[PDB]
Design a protein around this ligand. Structure first.
Ligand SMILES: [Ca+2]
Length: 534
């Protein structure tokens, strides 16, 4: 019958990608379809509505009631199964609350079902399969499908951490005022006045990982060296991915282990659930929906240190991710994400500034990066993290996908620096120490070293939220609107520096109040808690 284009799936060949022929032989391949769901408008409105309410008197939805009220319908899954069967695909697994389904079949079947021709591509960052053109499905099913992910398997995200390269002191003079010292997460938390007497007991922090793994020896050695009891850590497999260390310190293991060590050191009473998934748009989405809707571990917080330029994703994939973050906000789950570690250009050399996703989502607490100089438990100096082209810098900027939220509009978010300007959601929301030169001591694959990157800030603040949730007795959930309504005295304002590592324009620059390098600044823990208490 007639076919219909599914919006947001158009793709031209990627820059630097080389076509290596059609995918054939017909091995079995899997994709994730995102279905329409019941009462989608009400869901968005409910969250957008609760904004005018302090998170300690709001009404969030419950996981057990969510599927029936806002999940995809069984009638719709039946139609998706009919569509699958009619094209040689199988509906392998349904996720009712999240409103998604995994379908698999030989390439010819996937090609036919979605109106694409999958091709092999070689690229400097890794070979993958993808399509050039658009996705078209039978008109009869088109209304039921909002997105198809996994057709393109290019690595979708980068873990936003960096290993320290320089540790040696100044020749004929060893001083301390910005380096070459390092901190434990506890030292940083003290500088940010995290509320004490709290360890996150009763909370579960979900940590999303798109590669690598952790080993118990590195973790045990780390916590023992701090003289603290280690948190309970469990691994969760998504789409067949598992806890699989590779042994490379600059590989995904570095991210996995720093995430656990930073969050665990500060909220050792929290259960840390680590969700492993493939590094593809489908894997990333499935890791987030699995954690957000997890009936077993029931996380109250999700920490993400992986991401990619918002323009490197298919629009339909970003929309599906954003919907999963809307679910988290509706369910009272806080989602934090590193804002990027490659400055205002986010690792792209096309002559444009780019912000990183998921940080760009209005439903995510975007975490920027600073260089922190602290001593005797106090902040002596805190500036924008910018160590140049090869050293990295905090992500930050103006989204070209998401409009400026009403709750963020009074902050000093500027128009985009790109040609044409234009308003958009400002990145980041808050910031914390991320400079490897004033980094965090960690144990990665058995060795003691120092790391930085905004990848450390998401777990740092995830632990802060866990402590605050413990004190409040109930989860704070979606915090963004609240943060922008709080008095400025709740934050340590960063006013000096810029996150431009591409040119001399000082792209974006810090200043009094909100800026596109550090957002509202570093939270002052005890003040934030006090402001959230009834
Ligand atoms: Ca500022």
């Amino acid at each position: 019958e007639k076919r219909e284009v599914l919006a947001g799936h158009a793709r031209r060949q990627a820059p630097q990608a080389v076509d290596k022929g059609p995918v054939t032989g017909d091995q079995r391949i899997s994709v994730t379809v995102v279905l329409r769901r019941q009462r989608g408008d009400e869901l968005e409105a409910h969250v957008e509505r609760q904004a005018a309410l302090a998170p300690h008197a709001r009404v969030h939805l419950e996981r057990e009631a969510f599927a029936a009220s806002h999940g995809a319908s069984l009638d719709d899954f039946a139609e998706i199964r009919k569509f699958a069967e009619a094209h040689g695909l199988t509906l392998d697994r349904a996720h009712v609350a999240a409103g998604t389904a995994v379908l698999s079949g030989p390439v010819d079947a996937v090609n036919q079902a979605f109106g694409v021709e999958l091709r092999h591509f070689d690229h400097p960052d890794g070979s993958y399969r993808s399509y050039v053109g658009d996705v078209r499905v039978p008109a009869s099913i088109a209304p039921l499908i909002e997105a198809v992910l996994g057709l393109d398997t290019r690595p979708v995200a980068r873990p936003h951490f960096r290993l320290r390269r320089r540790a040696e002191g100044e020749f004929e003079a060893r001083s301390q005022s910005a380096a070459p010292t390092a901190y434990t997460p506890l030292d940083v938390a003290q500088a940010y006045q995290f509320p004490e007497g709290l360890d996150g007991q009763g909370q579960c922090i979900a940590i999303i990982e798109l590669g690598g793994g952790y080993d118990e020896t590195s973790l045990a050695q780390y916590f023992a060296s701090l003289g603290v009891s280690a948190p309970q850590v469990v691994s969760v497999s998504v789409d067949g991915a598992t806890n699989q260390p590779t042994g490379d310190p600059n590989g995904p293991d570095g991210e996995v282990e720093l995430d656990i060590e930073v969050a665990g050191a500060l909220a050792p009473g929290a259960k840390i659930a680590v969700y492993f998934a493939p590094n593809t748009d489908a894997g990333f989405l499935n890791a987030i929906t699995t954690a957000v809707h997890d009936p077993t571990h029931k996380p109250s917080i999700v920490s993400i240190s992986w991401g990619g330029p918002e323009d490197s994703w298919a629009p339909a994939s970003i929309a599906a991710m954003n919907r999963a973050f809307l679910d988290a906000a509706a369910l009272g789950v806080t989602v934090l994400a590193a804002a990027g570690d490659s400055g205002s250009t986010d690792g792209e050399q096309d002559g444009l500034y780019h912000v990183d996703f998921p940080a760009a989502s209005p439903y995510v607490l975007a975490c920027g990066g600073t260089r922190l100089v602290a001593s005797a438990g106090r902040i002596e100096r805190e500036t924008v993290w910018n160590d140049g082209p090869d050293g990295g810098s905090t992500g930050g900027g103006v989204s070209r996908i998401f409009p400026l939220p009403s709750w963020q509009e009074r902050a000093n978010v500027p128009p985009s620096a790109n040609p044409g300007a234009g308003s958009g959601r400002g990145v980041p929301d808050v910031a914390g120490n991320a400079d490897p030169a004033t980094g965090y001591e960690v144990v990665i694959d058995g060795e003691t070293t120092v790391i930085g990157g905004t990848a450390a800030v998401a777990p740092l603040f995830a632990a802060l939220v866990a402590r605050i949730n413990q004190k409040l007795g109930k989860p704070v959930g979606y915090l963004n609107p609240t943060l922008y309504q709080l008095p400025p005295e709740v934050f340590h304002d960063i006013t000096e520096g810029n996150n431009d590592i591409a040119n001399r324009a000082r792209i974006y620059q810090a200043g009094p109040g909100w800026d596109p390098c550090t957002g509202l600044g570093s939270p002052i823990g005890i003040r934030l808690l006090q402001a959230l208490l009834p």
